Design a protein around this nucleic acid. Structure first.
Lengths: 665, 475, 62, 188, 274, 193
DNA sequence: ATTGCCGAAGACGAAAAAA
DNA sequence: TTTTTTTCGTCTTCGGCAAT
């Protein structure tokens, strides 16, 4: 019966950082120890108030990270009770989409108009019909009496479930695993799942239904929250989904009592006439469609009054209800999603969305076509429900010491706290490269995407000098595939004229989960080359998930170009304007800093935490700008550390001298 | 305070009315004011140290060169431009490097960096034509604004660099000496402002010195390898152009597959019957011929050609005198090149020497020096000490010699020889030569005997043969 | 044959200096005393006292 | 010290990367020179013992000395090797198979040992090396690696699985400490 | 134990055999040294005995204390032997032996003060003729004699020792000659003298080998012979110069020849007889 | 001199010395060596033990002590000379016993020294005799103890073949020399170790 | 110990041929 | 002719040789 010296040092301050009952920010290591130490620091409050006992929820980017949260938390609990447990008598359980957990329901109802929500509705309908009478001929073979059985009930609390292993359990048994979890969610003290589910205010209302009481939420690698929340908040319409909803309403046999001038089919035709006409008129190559543009083609064509539109909205709901009851007796959703998108359109959501139409796919005589949506420009309005009275939040990303960007993104001021004991600067080394004599002029980067001489000179040549001299397993990160392809001639060259000749491995698109592992098996086993070894990958890509090997499989990472991003002349451009109006100093916060963290995740994944070591180099002309404002890992954590400096008259020599120093340690 | 300070020109002197009493000069020399030579303007450090300053109220505001492009120079050459940014006109004015490693590029870069209305001084039209070939990356609209400016015509804003001209003074259509009062100078006679001198040793001579002396001349840069003739005028060049910013470029910093490690040698040769009778007795310009043609020394030169041709090395033999050149070369039946050899026949001999494995020794007169594309070889023999310039021996060695293949990173892979007749005025040049080459970083030795010259066929095998040459030389 | 003896100094030289000595002998002031005779091209019978002078003069002269 | 008898197969990396000046000009010179010092010190402390010497070079294995109890052959072989140097890349599987073949023959109470000096990052052999590591542990052939500036995972597992001795060397002083650690006998 | 006399005896035999002419003894004497030794030794032949005598004191460097005292007891016998014996080789032996006894500190300062041996070292030290080899042992003896005195409070010898002062003339010579070795020996004497009694007393160079060569230049000091009466007297007088190796030149058609000055006299004598 | 140094000399008494023909000389030489050793530093100490045929015995007990040491050694050896174990009556010597005594002394001296700082000790054996199988366990026990203690055991074999001693030096990291020319004993002692 | 008047050798335009 | 190629001629550095 104990806990770490670190937890004891920073418990009282962390309980205080928690007292404010709404928000806080926490600084932690690059990953190793961070999540386990959170669970150790929430052990102090596992029953802070007996009369209500709050819960913990954790938000997670991908399924392999979730098994890392489960395996650590399973070690910490050891069991649900004092019978075998000694820190937490807790219950914990993994979750993820119905789309991931269940394969057979995706396979069987094969149609374009078949939403993942709709499939649970369909499965529920077959289960009720079978229970009513229809067991001999209509259950969808995935929902029945096992739902409420003791044998099914036991593994979840005995075991402390992993998501992959629930899927393995769920196949063979032939019982919908997602529903058993969803029924089971209320009994559990802790939950681990997606960020895309939680950030969405409508899903958050259903998530909070399953918890059945108040909670805390922790965002692990929280810089992702803003891009996920707008992606999840925005909604859209599609031309094919209306063309299917129209056949389905006509198949329903419509109605027999609208007045001679109109009908449900005629009214859809009025709505469709407006969207179809924008497809011809609007865009083909590029767009600039605003929330202003839709109303005028609606207003001219219809020549209408409100009474009539209110009724047409009512009559759409009535065809949809007829359709929904009629879908339910079928057991295998567009009239609903059309009822609502039209209702939002005649209503509003102008405080939080703006409508865009976007180039289609023509090109070919396909049906994907130009897509139309209610695009959420900025997350700030969309995030607010996280802070509201049924909950409280806490945010972290390993490093975050310069603090400002999170309060900038929040428009709220959390309680701040640094809540781990860090290690000396000397185990890490963070180089930059640009040239070593006055004739080394090929790195102007006025057009780095076009400068052949610059790609051929220190961008291709320094990589080959550093990799050949420093013979260790090293992964070269690039800003795009196109750069990666030009820099390494490889076995497969984009031209005969490219300037690296050495054994490296590729990591290109159509990555495959099994194929990814083959490359990591190769890098960990031997030789320079593999995934994370002498191999090229774009910094945005999947290699950023890393591997959870004990072995220090990584050594050096050389970022060939500083990871940078762009700002599309559409909703993104509208966002840049807004943040210019508010901050002024928008470019460094909105794009540069956000790209450097993209850098820092890949390097963070290489060096892992305090119990390891490493180096990480950046190749760019503009690199000093990156060094200011502590936008990279190099920045302060404890004054006593004796600095993390990288200036030298030769990088390659300094890293080989640093590796001798590390072998000696 | 200098906010009102006039400054003006009289014949070759600057006089300063109602003065600020500037450091380092005489006062009330003949009136209440200060008066210096024009050429003293170069001493900007003496006011800069004091914390004094001045203004160019005489200025002209017209347009100037931009030349925004850049190129890549040798590692010391860049360090040398970097230093020049560092030091500025108070502590700058000449750079010394060989006539075969990038001097044209330093001139076009020196003008593109300094960026002022410029006049370029050169020795020769061929060198203008090489600087044009160098300058094509900076040239404005490639070939529609570059022009020559000399004794036949003048046109356009630029050319071989900026406007180039020649040092010459034959009459009113030379180039720089006749025009020396019309244009140049930003501070008085104020049309241009920057001077770039190629082959800078050429200007401090007694007539020429006046081109430079009879102006204030704001910015000046000089470039050279020979730097001075045997009498050493070079203290004057500190005043005339400016102090020396660089000298080194040692082959010690460019060995391993970079260039060539030269074993330098001097060869002391003894003196055979009748030639010193006559050397001692004759005090006239013929006596130079008895110490150069001394048959014991000729036999060393022949033995040395035989050794390096037996190894198939490429050899240039230098002879300071067309008589000596032809008497050595016709006896050894190797081609020779000099003034009166035409371009067609020189380019045939030189193509044969570079690409034909049968043509491995050639003889050349003073025409190589100062502006000439001497070919590559690995062996250099000088038949005499000549009093041209110890520094030109090192320019000539440095342009001509390279590493012999496969041995490209060894202690030596190229060879220089200078032949000296013992007991003559030819010996005096050695203690200077030796000190200058070792100060230039070269390994240098003296060879005093060859007892393997007593093991093979060579010329002058008898007194009677030597007598046959002695009568011809005496005449 | 032991008719006559003469103390003298025998100078052995090369085929380029003995000539200078002879020249030294003539066209000189207070000289011409110097060489007794030329026994061989290489050798001369000379001086005694003059030897110091002959050598020194040769040195000073080119 | 007396109590039991040792059999040790000394295996040296004669690949091209060994011709590097990082430690004793071309690692080759510094390693063979200290390895000669080790043979005489090991033979001393271990008077009743045997050694055999193998190299990996130019993608093959070669026998520098046969398995024997006279130190003189092994110092004479380390002297004769320096002249012929190093080129190419390892062959570790073929070197563990010849070493296995000699070591399997040896009787019950004697040690089975392989000492490897490693300056590479992989090995050229096609054969499955994991089957051979399983077979070393069954045979009781213990393999030790002294690596130069290098932790490449198959070599480190191979030394751990066979008995627990993967060491890193960063100087000529550290390499003499490591070989002198080996000179030390096993318990009996 | 019995083996001891036999083994060492064989080397005693070897030294005895090649005792007389050269310097065989030194190496063998050393071996002999380790394994009333002095009393017994005395009977044996002098040379070699002295050699053994010399090295044994050196070799000494508990029981050792006993050894030194034992040696001290018969220091007189060796001393009597040393004198009386008194080539360069012998001379070297006598002082080397004396020197060795001196460092041992067994010798009596008195007794030494008035003895021929001390006169003899400065005598050889004074004379110019003595060779470098004799000089070094003579010098060493003096140094050791002074070294022996670590007092001078009671040491008559440090009076005779003063005899070093006589040496300065010798050092002047020696200096005149380029005899560096001799001078160094002198300095050692001086330095040692001061030490004992100090309390009581109050490229570029290429032209330098060329400048050396400018100081060497040839001719020869010489007799010429002419007006010879007939060819037989040139050929006799010439052949009798050529066997004397002092022909500088000859020409039989001149009947004329040259001899350098060093064999003028052997020619003047042969010209008178035959 | 900062480090106290104890050098224990074990002298093999075996009548093999008869073959030597001399023991008296060997003692004289050993005495000279000891005196030098003690003279070198204040902190040097010496212990002398005799390994005889029948048993091991202590010869004596600092350099000031040397006079005492000389007398004690001469007297002790003479007593040893007794007829029993005469000539090769008994080929072997009791080295194991001698080493045991030596380690005990070193240990005791070390404890006292422990109160102070560290002590360095080494054992020197002058070995005339031959080893025997019966001897193996006992000798090795002492040898291994020394190795663990990190006390080097040097051996100078005047004659005979004591393999165990040769092994002893190897394990111990000491020095072993088989002397050619036993009369050179003094040189070996000074020079060899 | 300085001035001052040849001869020798080299470099650049320009006049004179040659078509 | 037009255009080009040779020799001629002028200015200048440098090593002696008399002459103040």
């Amino acid at each position: 019966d104990y806990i770490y010296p670190e937890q004891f040092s920073y418990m009282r301050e962390l309980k205080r950082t928690l007292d404010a009952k709404g928000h806080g920010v926490l600084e932690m290591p690059s990953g190793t120890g961070k999540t386990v130490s959170l669970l150790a620091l929430i052990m102090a409050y596992q029953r802070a108030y007996p009369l209500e006992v709050t819960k913990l929820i954790y938000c997670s980017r991908t399924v392999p990270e979730i098994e890392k949260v489960i395996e650590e938390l399973r070690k910490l609990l050891n069991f649900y009770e004092k019978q075998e447990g000694e820190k937490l008598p807790f219950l914990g359980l993994a979750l993820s989409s119905r789309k991931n957990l269940c394969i057979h329901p995706e396979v069987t109802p094969l149609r374009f108009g078949k939403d993942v929500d709709g499939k649970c509705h369909s499965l529920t309908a077959s289960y009720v019909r079978a229970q009513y009478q229809h067991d001999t001929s209509l259950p969808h073979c995935r929902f029945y009496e096992e739902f409420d059985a003791h044998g099914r009930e036991v593994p979840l609390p005995a075991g402390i479930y992993n998501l992959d292993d629930l899927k393995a359990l769920g196949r063979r048994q032939g019982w919908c695993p997602y529903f058993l979890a969803r029924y089971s969610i209320l009994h559990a003290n802790v939950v681990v799942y997606s960020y895309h589910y939680l950030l969405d205010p409508k899903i958050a209302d259903l998530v909070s239904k399953e918890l059945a009481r108040k909670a805390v939420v922790v965002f692990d690698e929280a810089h992702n929250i803003d891009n996920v929340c707008i992606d999840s908040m925005s909604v859209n319409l599609t031309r094919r989904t209306l063309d299917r909803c129209q056949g389905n309403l006509e198949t329903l046999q419509k109605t027999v009592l609208r007045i001679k001038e109109t009908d449900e089919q005629r009214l859809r035709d009025e709505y469709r006439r407006l969207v179809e006409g924008l497809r011809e008129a609007s865009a083909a190559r590029e767009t600039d469609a605003h929330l202003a543009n839709p109303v005028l083609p609606d207003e001219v064509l219809q020549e209408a009054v409100p009474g009539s539109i209110r009724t047409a909205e009512h009559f759409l709901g009535f065809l949809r209800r007829l359709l929904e009851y009629v879908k339910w007796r079928l057991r295998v959703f567009s009239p609903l999603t059309l009822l609502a998108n039209f209702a939002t359109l005649v209503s509003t959501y102008a405080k939080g969305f703006t409508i865009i139409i976007e180039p289609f796919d023509d090109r070919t005589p396909t049906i994907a076509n130009p897509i139309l949506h209610f695009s959420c420009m900025d997350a700030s309005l969309a995030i607010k429900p996280v802070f509201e009275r049924f909950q409280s939040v806490i945010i972290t990303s390993g490093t975050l010491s310069p603090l400002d960007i999170y309060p900038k993104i929040l428009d709220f001021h959390p309680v701040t706290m640094a809540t781990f004991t860090m290690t000396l600067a000397r185990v890490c080394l963070c180089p930059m490269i640009i040239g070593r004599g006055n004739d080394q002029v090929a790195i102007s980067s006025k057009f780095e995407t076009r400068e052949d001489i610059a790609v051929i000179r220190n961008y291709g040549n320094l990589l080959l000098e550093m990799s050949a001299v420093v013979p260790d397993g090293i992964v070269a990160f690039f800003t795009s595939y196109q750069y990666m392809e030009s820099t390494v001639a490889s076995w497969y060259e984009q031209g005969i004229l490219e300037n690296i000749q050495r054994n490296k491995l590729l990591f290109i698109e159509t990555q495959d989960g099994a194929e990814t592992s083959v490359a990591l098996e190769k890098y960990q086993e031997a030789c320079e080359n593999g995934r994370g070894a002498i191999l090229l990958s774009v910094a945005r890509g999947k290699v950023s998930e890393g591997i959870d090997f004990v072995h220090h499989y990584g050594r050096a990472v050389i970022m060939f170009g500083v990871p940078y991003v762009y700002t599309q002349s559409r909703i993104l451009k509208a966002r840049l304007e807004y943040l210019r109006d508010q901050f002024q100093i928008r470019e460094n916060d909105f794009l540069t800093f956000d790209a450097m963290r993209h850098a820092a995740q890949c390097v963070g994944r290489a060096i892992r935490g305090k119990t390891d070591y490493g180096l990480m180099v950046f190749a760019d002309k503009r690199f000093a700008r990156g060094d200011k404002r502590g936008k990279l890992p190099r920045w302060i954590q404890e004054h006593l550390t004796d600095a993390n400096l990288n200036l030298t008259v030769d990088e390659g020599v300094q890293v080989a001298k640093y590796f001798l120093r590390q072998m000696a340690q | 305070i200098p906010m009102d300070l006039f400054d003006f020109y009289e014949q070759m002197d600057k006089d300063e009315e109602e003065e600020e009493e500037t450091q380092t000069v005489s006062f009330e020399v003949k009136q209440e004011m200060i008066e210096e030579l024009q050429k003293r303007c170069i001493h900007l450090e003496y006011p800069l140290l004091a914390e004094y300053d001045f203004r160019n109220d005489s200025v002209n505001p017209d347009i100037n060169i931009d030349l925004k492009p850049t190129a890549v120079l040798r590692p010391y050459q860049e360090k040398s431009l970097r230093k020049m940014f560092g030091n500025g006109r108070a502590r700058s004015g000449v750079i010394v490097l060989p006539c075969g490693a990038g001097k044209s590029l330093v001139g076009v870069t020196a003008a593109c960096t300094v960026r002022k209305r410029c006049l370029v001084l050169g020795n020769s039209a061929v060198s203008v034509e090489q600087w044009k070939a160098q300058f094509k990356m900076w040239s404005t609209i490639d070939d529609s604004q570059i022009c020559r400016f000399t004794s036949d015509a003048k046109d356009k804003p630029i050319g071989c660099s900026v406007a180039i001209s020649t040092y010459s003074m034959l009459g009113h259509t030379t180039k720089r000496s006749w025009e020396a009062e019309r244009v140049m100078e930003w501070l008085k006679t104020q049309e241009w402002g920057l001077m770039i001198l190629d082959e800078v040793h050429t200007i401090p001579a007694k007539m020429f010195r006046r081109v430079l002396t009879i102006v204030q001349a704001h910015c000046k840069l000089g470039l050279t390898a020979t730097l001075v003739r045997e009498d050493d005028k070079i203290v004057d060049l500190n005043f005339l152009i400016g102090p020396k910013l660089y000298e080194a470029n040692w082959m010690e910093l460019q060995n391993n597959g970079y260039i060539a490690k030269v074993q330098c040698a001097e060869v002391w040769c003894p003196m055979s019957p009748e030639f010193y009778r006559e050397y001692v007795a004759i005090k006239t310009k013929k006596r130079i011929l008895l110490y150069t043609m001394n048959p014991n020394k000729f036999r060393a030169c022949q033995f040395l050609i035989k050794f390096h041709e037996r190894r198939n090395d490429k050899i240039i033999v230098f002879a300071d005198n067309v008589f000596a050149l032809k008497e050595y070369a016709i006896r050894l039946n190797k081609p020779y090149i000099y003034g009166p050899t035409s371009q067609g026949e020189r380019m045939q001999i030189l193509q044969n020497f570079k690409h034909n494995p049968k043509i491995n020794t050639i003889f050349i007169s003073k025409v190589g020096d100062t502006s000439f594309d001497l070919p590559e070889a690995n062996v250099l023999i000088q038949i005499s000490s000549h009093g041209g310039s110890r520094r030109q021996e090192a320019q000539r060695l440095g342009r001509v010699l390279r590493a012999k293949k496969g041995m490209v990173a060894e202690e030596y892979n190229a060879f220089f020889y200078s032949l000296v007749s013992q007991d003559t005025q030819e010996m005096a040049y050695s203690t200077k030569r030796q000190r200058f080459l070792v100060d230039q970083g070269y390994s240098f030795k003296v060879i005093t005997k060859l007892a393997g010259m007593e093991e093979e066929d060579l010329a002058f095998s008898t007194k009677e043969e030597q007598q046959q040459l002695l009568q011809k030389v005496l005449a | 044959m032991v008719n006559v003896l003469k103390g003298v100094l025998i100078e052995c030289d090369p085929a380029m200096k003995q000539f200078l000595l002879y020249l030294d002998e003539s066209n000189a002031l207070g000289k011409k005393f110097i060489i007794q005779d030329i026994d061989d091209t290489h050798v001369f019978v000379i001086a005694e006292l003059v030897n110091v002078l002959q050598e020194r003069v040769g040195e000073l002269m080119d | 010290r007396l109590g039991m008898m040792r059999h040790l197969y000394v295996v040296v990396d004669g690949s091209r990367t060994m011709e590097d000046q990082d430690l004793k000009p071309n690692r080759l010179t510094c390693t063979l020179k200290l390895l000669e010092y080790f043979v005489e010190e090991y033979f001393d402390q271990n008077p009743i013992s045997q050694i055999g010497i193998i190299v990996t070079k130019s993608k093959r294995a070669e026998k520098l000395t046969e398995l024997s109890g006279n130190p003189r052959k092994h110092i004479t072989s380390l002297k004769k090797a320096v002249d012929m140097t190093c080129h190419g890349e390892p062959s570790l599987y073929n070197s563990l198979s010849i070493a296995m073949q000699t070591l399997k023959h040896m009787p019950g109470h004697t040690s089975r040992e392989v000492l490897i000096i490693f300056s590479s990052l992989t090995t050229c052999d096609p054969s499955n090396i994991y089957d051979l590591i399983k077979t070393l542990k069954a045979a009781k052939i213990r393999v030790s690696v002294i690596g130069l500036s290098a932790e490449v995972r198959v070599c480190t597992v191979l030394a751990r699985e066979t008995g627990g001795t993967y060491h890193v060397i960063l100087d000529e002083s550290h390499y003499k400490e490591l070989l002198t650690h080996h000179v030390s006998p096993p318990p009996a | 134990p019995g083996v001891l006399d036999r083994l060492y005896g064989h080397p005693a035999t070897c030294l005895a055999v090649f005792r007389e002419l050269p310097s065989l003894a030194k190496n063998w004497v050393m071996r002999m040294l380790f394994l009333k030794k002095e009393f017994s030794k005395a009977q044996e032949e002098s040379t070699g005995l002295l050699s053994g005598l010399r090295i044994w004191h050196t070799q000494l460097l508990n029981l050792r204390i006993a050894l030194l005292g034992g040696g001290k007891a018969w220091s007189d016998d060796t001393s009597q032997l040393g004198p009386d014996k008194h080539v360069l080789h012998f001379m070297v032996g006598s002082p080397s032996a004396a020197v060795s006894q001196d460092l041992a500190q067994l010798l009596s300062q008195a007794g030494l003060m008035k003895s021929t041996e001390p006169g003899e070292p400065p005598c050889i030290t004074s004379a110019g003729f003595q060779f470098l080899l004799l000089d070094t042992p003579a010098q060493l003896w003096y140094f050791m004699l002074q070294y022996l005195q670590t007092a001078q409070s009671r040491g008559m010898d440090l009076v005779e020792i003063l005899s070093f002062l006589f040496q300065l003339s010798f050092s002047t010579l020696g200096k005149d000659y380029s005899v560096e070795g001799m001078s160094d020996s002198l300095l050692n004497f001086l330095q040692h003298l001061r030490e004992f009694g100090l309390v009581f007393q109050r490229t570029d160079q290429i032209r330098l080998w060329e400048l050396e060569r400018d100081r060497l230049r040839f001719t020869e000091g010489v007799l010429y012979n002419q007006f010879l009466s007939q060819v037989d007297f040139e050929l006799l007088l010439a052949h009798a110069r050529e066997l004397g190796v002092l022909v500088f030149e000859n020409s039989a058609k001149r009947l004329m020849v040259v001899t350098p000055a060093g064999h003028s006299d052997v020619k003047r004598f042969w010209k008178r007889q035959k | 001199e900062d480090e106290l140094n104890l050098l224990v000399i074990v002298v093999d008494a075996n009548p093999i010395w008869w073959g030597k023909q001399t023991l008296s000389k060997c003692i004289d030489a050993v005495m000279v060596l000891g005196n030098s050793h003690l003279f070198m530093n204040r902190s040097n100490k010496l212990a002398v033990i005799a390994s005889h045929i029948q048993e091991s015995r202590f010869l004596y007990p600092k350099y000031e002590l040397l006079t005492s040491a000389n007398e004690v050694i001469v007297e002790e050896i003479k007593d040893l000379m007794t007829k029993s174990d005469i000539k090769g009556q008994h080929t072997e010597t009791l080295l194991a016993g001698s080493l045991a005594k030596a380690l005990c002394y070193i240990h005791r001296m070390n404890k006292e020294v422990k109160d102070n700082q560290e002590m360095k000790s080494r054992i020197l054996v002058i070995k005339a005799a031959e080893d025997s199988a019966l001897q193996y366990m006992n000798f090795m026990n002492v040898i291994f103890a020394a190795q663990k203690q990190n006390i080097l055991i040097d051996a100078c074999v005047l004659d005979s073949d004591s393999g165990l001693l040769q092994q002893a030096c190897d394990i111990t990291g000491g020095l072993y020399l088989k002397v050619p020319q036993m009369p050179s004993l003094l040189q070996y002692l000074l020079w060899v170790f």
